[PDB]
Paper text:
In the present study, we describe a modular endolysin (rare for Gram-negative infecting phages) originating from B. cenocepacia AP3 phage. The structure of endolysin, predicted in silico in BLASTP, is modular, consisting of CBD (10-65 aa; PG_binding_1 domain; pfam01471) at the N-terminus, and DUF3380 domain (pfam11860) at the C-terminus (90-262 aa). Thus, comparable to lysozyme, AP3gp15 cleaves β-1,4-glycosidic bond of PG and releases GlcNAc and MurNAc. Similarly to others, the AP3 endolysin shows a broad spectrum of activity against Gram-negative strains, but no PG-degrading properties with respect to Gram-positives.
The overall structure comprises of two clearly distinguished domains, a smaller N-terminal CBD domain (Lys3 – Ser66), and a larger EAD domain (Asp77 – Ala264) located towards the C-terminus. CBD domain is composed of a bundle of three antiparallel helices (α1-α3) and is joined with EAD via a hinge region spanning amino acids (Ala67 – Thr76). The EAD domain is organized into two sub-domains: first encompassing helices α4-α5 (Asp77 – Glu101) and helices α10 to α15 (Gly185 – Ala266), and the second containing β1 (Ile115 – Tyr117), β2-β3 (Thr176 – Met184) sheet intervened by helices α6 to α9 (Arg119 – Ala175). The structure of the EAD domain of AP3gp15 is characterized by a deep concave cleft at the subdomain interface. Despite a relatively low homology of amino acid sequence (31% and 39% identity, respectively), a high structural homology of the entire AP3gp15 N-terminal part to the domains of clearly identified function strongly suggests its role in PG interaction. The large enzymatic C-terminal domain of AP3 endolysin shows structural homology to proteins of lysozyme family. The comparison to HEWL, the closest structural homologue among lysozymes, allowed to define the core structure of AP3 endolysin, where the entire fold of HEWL is encompassed within α5, α10, α12, α14 and α15. This core is decorated with large protrusions (α6-α9) characteristic only for AP3 phage endolysin and not present in classical lysozymes. The crystal structure analysis suggests that only a single catalytic residue (Glu101) is present at the active site of AP3 endolysin. Experimental data of AP3gp15 mutant Glu101Ala with a decline in activity by 99.4%, confirmed of Glu101 involvement in the catalytic reaction.
Numbering used by the authors: 2 to 130, 136 to 266
């Protein structure tokens, strides 16, 4: 089923509303995904170990249609743990998770979502002591991305140049944490970092938590709900073009309201 959210209308919404009612909700079946429908999705998610974001996406649909929950998927309780780790208001963590996560931390084939960065590979190889031989894989210029499972082909090729460097030059999981942070974030080595990324979305969120903890300016921005500053630090100079700042701000308002 297609992902549904606040403001959606139509046959897919009435189908959702019926499924929510079958799972115990009380709703008017009017094909309008308004606040009552959103609240019901949230209540359903919370009670079935999903992330309670009020968005009926593929994870919610899977539980709602088949009663299945993948144990690799992030839960509400993981977000509460992250809020405790960060000393950040839970609503702020929920907002960050909604806006900044890729959502699914794993590809359909079960491996973590990755993006291999040939310009970082270039950098890690130089620091360890090729760009002409393998220009798509090693390059001072950014890019060459394939995406999705095809990234693993690029990673596999890079790994044959240097296994540690290639993992360091790749971003991992739902928050796309660069492997080269493994040391800064207190992991034993890059292989252990990657192994953790393969276990669960909870581990992928833990990487994000550590990443934020390692940058006190970023941490402070998050704690103080300085969304534009957090987005600039986290997403980079082009944060505004994708509305990260305002999406965070408006998500946080939603979650602050919901918790009240």
């Amino acid at each position: 089923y297609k992902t549904l959210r606040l403001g959606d209308r139509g046959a897919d919404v009435s189908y959702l509303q019926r499924q929510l009612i079958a799972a115990g909700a009380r709703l008017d079946i009017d094909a309008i995904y308004g606040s009552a429908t959103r609240d019901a999705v949230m209540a359903f998610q919370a009670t079935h170990g999903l992330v309670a974001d009020g968005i009926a996406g593929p994870k919610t649909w899977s539980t709602l249609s088949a009663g299945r929950r993948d144990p690799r998927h992030l839960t509400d309780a993981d977000l509460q743990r992250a809020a405790d780790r960060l000393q950040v208001d839970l609503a702020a963590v929920r907002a960050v998770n909604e806006v900044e996560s890729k959502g699914a931390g794993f590809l359909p084939d079960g491996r973590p979502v990755i993006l291999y960065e040939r310009h970082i590979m270039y950098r890690q190889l130089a620091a360890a002591g090729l760009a002409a031989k393998y220009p798509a894989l090693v390059n001072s210029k950014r890019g060459g991305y394939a995406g999705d499972a095809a990234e693993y082909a690029r990673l596999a090729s890079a790994s044959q140049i240097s296994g540690a460097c290639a993992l360091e030059a790749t971003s991992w999981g739902a928050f796309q944490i660069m492997g080269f942070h493994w040391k800064a974030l207190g992991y034993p080595d890059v292989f252990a970092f990657v192994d953790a990324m393969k276990v669960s979305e909870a581990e992928q969120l833990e990487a994000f938590v550590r990443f934020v903890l390692a940058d006190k300016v970023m941490l402070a921005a998050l704690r103080s709900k300085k969304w534009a500053k957090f987005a600039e630090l986290y997403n980079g100079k082009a944060y505004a073009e994708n509305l990260y700042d305002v999406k965070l701000e408006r998500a946080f308002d939603r979650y602050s309201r919901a918790a009240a």
